[PDB]
Enzyme design. Structure first.
Site, short mmCIF file in Angstrom:
data_model
loop_
_atom_site.label_atom_id
_atom_site.label_comp_id
_atom_site.label_asym_id
_atom_site.label_seq_id
_atom_site.Cartn_x
_atom_site.Cartn_y
_atom_site.Cartn_z
N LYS A 100 0.83 -1.19 0.00
CA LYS A 100 0.00 0.00 0.00
C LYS A 100 0.87 1.25 0.00
O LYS A 100 2.05 1.18 0.34
CB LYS A 100 -0.95 0.02 1.21
CG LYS A 100 -0.36 -0.49 2.56
CD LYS A 100 0.84 0.31 3.08
CE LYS A 100 0.53 1.79 3.33
NZ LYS A 100 1.76 2.52 3.76
N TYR A 185 -4.42 3.96 6.46
CA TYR A 185 -4.88 2.98 7.47
C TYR A 185 -6.20 3.40 8.12
O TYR A 185 -7.02 2.54 8.47
CB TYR A 185 -3.82 2.76 8.56
CG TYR A 185 -2.61 1.99 8.09
CD1 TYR A 185 -1.52 2.66 7.54
CD2 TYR A 185 -2.56 0.61 8.20
CE1 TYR A 185 -0.40 1.96 7.12
CE2 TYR A 185 -1.44 -0.09 7.78
CZ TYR A 185 -0.37 0.58 7.24
OH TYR A 185 0.74 -0.12 6.82
N1 NDP Z 1 2.47 -2.40 5.13
C1 NDP Z 1 3.39 -1.73 5.94
O1 NDP Z 1 3.29 -1.85 7.18
C2 NDP Z 1 4.44 -0.93 5.32
C3 NDP Z 1 4.38 -0.68 3.98
N2 NDP Z 1 5.38 0.09 3.39
C4 NDP Z 1 5.35 0.34 1.95
O2 NDP Z 1 6.52 -0.24 1.43
C5 NDP Z 1 7.05 0.59 0.35
C6 NDP Z 1 8.52 0.98 0.70
O3 NDP Z 1 8.49 1.58 1.97
P1 NDP Z 1 10.04 1.52 2.80
O4 NDP Z 1 10.47 0.11 2.64
O5 NDP Z 1 9.61 2.14 4.11
O6 NDP Z 1 10.85 2.55 1.84
P2 NDP Z 1 12.51 2.41 1.84
O7 NDP Z 1 12.90 3.75 1.30
O8 NDP Z 1 13.00 2.00 3.19
O9 NDP Z 1 12.91 1.23 0.77
C7 NDP Z 1 12.47 1.59 -0.50
C8 NDP Z 1 13.29 0.72 -1.47
O10 NDP Z 1 12.73 0.75 -2.78
C9 NDP Z 1 13.80 0.64 -3.70
N3 NDP Z 1 13.73 1.72 -4.69
C10 NDP Z 1 13.58 1.59 -6.06
N4 NDP Z 1 13.57 2.78 -6.71
C11 NDP Z 1 13.72 3.73 -5.69
C12 NDP Z 1 13.79 5.13 -5.72
N5 NDP Z 1 13.69 5.81 -6.91
N6 NDP Z 1 13.94 5.86 -4.57
C13 NDP Z 1 14.03 5.11 -3.41
N7 NDP Z 1 13.98 3.78 -3.23
C14 NDP Z 1 13.83 3.09 -4.42
C15 NDP Z 1 15.17 0.64 -2.90
O11 NDP Z 1 15.51 -0.61 -2.78
P3 NDP Z 1 16.88 -1.17 -3.68
O12 NDP Z 1 17.95 -0.38 -2.99
O13 NDP Z 1 16.84 -2.67 -3.41
O14 NDP Z 1 16.50 -0.72 -5.07
C16 NDP Z 1 14.73 1.26 -1.57
O15 NDP Z 1 15.54 0.74 -0.57
C17 NDP Z 1 6.12 1.85 0.29
O16 NDP Z 1 5.10 1.66 -0.71
C18 NDP Z 1 5.46 1.88 1.66
O17 NDP Z 1 4.16 2.43 1.63
C19 NDP Z 1 6.42 0.64 4.17
C20 NDP Z 1 6.51 0.43 5.48
C21 NDP Z 1 5.53 -0.40 6.19
O1 BGC Z 2 2.82 1.06 11.05
C1 BGC Z 2 3.33 2.34 10.62
C2 BGC Z 2 3.96 2.23 9.21
O2 BGC Z 2 2.92 1.97 8.29
C3 BGC Z 2 3.43 1.91 6.96
O3 BGC Z 2 2.42 1.45 6.06
C4 BGC Z 2 3.92 3.21 6.52
O4 BGC Z 2 4.39 3.18 5.17
C5 BGC Z 2 5.10 3.56 7.44
O5 BGC Z 2 5.55 4.85 7.07
C6 BGC Z 2 4.66 3.53 8.87
O6 BGC Z 2 5.79 3.70 9.72
#
Ligand code: NDP
Ligand code: BGC
Ligand code: NDP
Ligand code: BGC
Ligand code: BGC
Lengths: 335, 335
Positions: A100, A185
């Site tokens: 999401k 959420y």
């Molecule tokens: N359901 C939940 O509880 C959560 C959901 N999320 C979702 O997960 C996704 C990623 O969030 P998060 O993991 O926090 O983000 P991060 O920035 O920590 O990781 C994002 C990763 O995406 C890859 N990537 C590819 N292109 C790009 C770019 N142009 N700029 C930056 N990163 C890029 C990189 O991986 P590489 O280096 O391998 O290319 C980067 O490490 C989002 O959609 C967020 O909403 C996030 C946190 C919790």
């Molecule tokens: O539980 C909280 C987490 O939810 C995720 O879906 C969001 O992308 C994060 O930014 C946040 O910290």
């Protein structure tokens, strides 16, 4: 039988939260890694025993079509990249788990759904809370009629975001501010607690544009939802306060969780004809993350549709567009 | 050194809640009774030792001008009768304590303010929460900067109302539904926690007109407030669910009370630096009712203005009119 996951985008959520939780899966295994950072492929490939043949860059990702150990691609990238990697995964003949928010817009969600349909592959959005013990208990209480008809849902989601340079605060990569990331959420919960879709939306935005974090996307955008049954919701979405909770109430009583949709630490309290008291949910077989992973796998193995499919993600984006419009236009938007 | 109160309208709040609390007052005493029920004058006159010379009907009330034992008239009637009894009290040379909501409309509040001003007498509205320990503590935390700038106030007030024939469910006597009676606590709290006046208002109403209770006035009306600082509020007002709480949050943490504005039983939790934890407020000398009573007396004795004067009641009615309008027109109303 375990289906093989390729994890795509080796960032915080992928590496700290999801990948360790294959440990408790019964129908899923980690099979491949896809990353734009070669050092991450080495680091995590070595840690998780993923051979070099199963490590892909974004440049070589389409070759995964020829890897029979990969059944599912889990896209865990910034929001604006969800659509192209989902489409590429589908054209590579893979089922898709997508984080999401599903995509930046309604149109992009529709494109993703069409691509997976054309490929004859399943699409699931990562709404892990639907697999979390306390959330499941709340939903069941509502459906059982323990509260009577739902009258109000009051739900707040936000965190104090930090580094102004991160992709969440960049409109091109995030698609929007707090609503896209954390406010979703509140929206998703209002929908699964009522079991309804809203017919009217109000919203107010409040963002200090002198804050270095908020030159491009919104900080606070709070919204109201009205549902066909007459149920109402008051929702907070914020990047400048910490909150994570909901309370659903009807004429017979109410139930709340705080924190509600966190990785762990959920606590539920209910008031159901007696005093307000802590309530322990019925035990679940495994944690919300492993359960989410196994759900898609089990759907594929049994030929069933995910309970949070692309359509659920699309329904959220539909309301999100209306929330942004309601705040922009200062009027109730009808759906 | 005690000022004499005449209690007008010997119903539930007057007789069960207020009159027993003269016991803990330091500067207020019960001096007279005004009632449209002869039996109550006899019953409570004998109980509280109020001589027949100090008992009045609504028909003989204006004679109270010749009673030097009476300094203050406390109007505790249905809402639509607040204005005429306040004006009659003022013309009888008495200071006035008037229950919330102040009156049905902005215009009626303005008339009451002008009548007391013409009489050179003070006017105070019965916002007892401003004298309640936990509420004072929440305001202090905000003022002292414990939360940083206020960003959100989330507050819900409601109760499951019963008998359809009661005056609260009669428009002619109540002036409106849940918002007039109980939702006003959400509004008033949003105002004293921020210390600001709203500049924009959204609202959603939900009322089942097939319910015997709701032929004339509203059940649920939820509203959003935007303040000049950028602070926001999401508020619930309801006659079909039970709630009584608020949380105020800023970048540094938050504080909540649940129940917030009940007669007793307040409980506060705060999140300041670490996990949410219980907080005991600084102690108050007197309970909120006695403190409210003594506040007006002390203002009269010292020539100071009440902290909750008629203008506070008016400021609420201004927003209440905006809330009703926003729900009716489906738009953001500017103030
Ligand atoms: N359901 C939940 O509880 C959560 C959901 N999320 C979702 O997960 C996704 C990623 O969030 P998060 O993991 O926090 O983000 P991060 O920035 O920590 O990781 C994002 C990763 O995406 C890859 N990537 C590819 N292109 C790009 C770019 N142009 N700029 C930056 N990163 C890029 C990189 O991986 P590489 O280096 O391998 O290319 C980067 O490490 C989002 O959609 C967020 O909403 C996030 C946190 C919790
Ligand atoms: O539980 C909280 C987490 O939810 C995720 O879906 C969001 O992308 C994060 O930014 C946040 O910290
Ligand atoms: N601040 C607080 O915490 C509370 C405030 N209130 C406020 O106090 C006021 C009264 O509430 P409550 O005491 O619960 O109401 P009640 O119905 O219990 O008492 C109302 C009284 O007003 C008098 N009255 C005068 N004219 C009428 C009329 N036409 N119809 C009915 N009663 C009439 C009667 O007293 P008599 O028989 O002596 O004429 C009646 O008993 C309201 O404005 C309410 O908002 C109420 C509860 C708590
Ligand atoms: O919440 C406690 C009480 O508050 C009062 O101001 C309302 O008039 C009552 O109806 C309510 O029971
Ligand atoms: O909640 C605050 C209150 O606590 C009570 O136990 C004390 O007796 C009061 O002095 C104090 O005002």
């Amino acid at each position: 039988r375990k289906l093989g996951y390729a994890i795509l985008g080796l960032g915080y959520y992928a590496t700290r939260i999801i990948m360790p939780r294959f440990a408790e899966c019964e129908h899923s295994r980690l099979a491949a890694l896809v990353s734009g950072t070669p050092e991450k492929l080495k680091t995590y490939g070595e840690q998780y025993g993923i051979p070099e043949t199963h490590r892909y860059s974004y440049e070589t990702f389409d070759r995964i079509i020829d890897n029979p150990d990969v059944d599912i691609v889990y896209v865990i990238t910034p929001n604006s990249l969800h659509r192209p990697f989902t489409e590429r995964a589908a054209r590579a003949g893979k089922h898709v788990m997508c984080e999401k928010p599903m995509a930046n817009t309604v149109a992009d969600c529709e494109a993703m759904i069409a691509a997976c349909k054309k490929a004859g592959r399943k699409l699931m959005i990562g709404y892990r809370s639907r697999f979390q013990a306390h959330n499941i208990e709340a939903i069941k209480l509502v459906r059982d009629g323990a509260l009577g008809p739902v009258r109000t849902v009051v739900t707040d989601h936000g965190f104090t975001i930090g580094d102004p340079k991160q992709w969440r605060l960049n409109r091109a990569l995030a698609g929007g501010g707090s609503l896209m990331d954390i406010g979703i959420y509140s929206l998703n919960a209002a929908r699964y607690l009522t079991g309804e879709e809203p017919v009217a939306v109000n919203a107010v935005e409040s963002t200090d544009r002198s804050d270095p974090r908020f030159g491009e996307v919104e900080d606070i955008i709070n919204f109201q939802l009205l549902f066909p049954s007459g149920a109402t919701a008051n929702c907070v979405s914020a990047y400048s306060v910490n909150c994570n909770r909901y309370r659903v109430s009807g004429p017979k009583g109410w139930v709340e969780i705080d924190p509600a949709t966190s990785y762990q630490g959920q606590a539920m309290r209910a008031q159901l004809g007696g005093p307000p008291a802590p309530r322990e949910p019925a035990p679940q077989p495994k944690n919300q993350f492993s359960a989410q992973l196994d759900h898609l796998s089990e759907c594929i193995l049994t030929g069933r549709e995910p309970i949070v499919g692309g359509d659920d993600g699309l329904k959220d984006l539909r309301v999100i567009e209306a929330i942004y419009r309601a705040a922009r236009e200062g009027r109730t938007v009808k759906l």
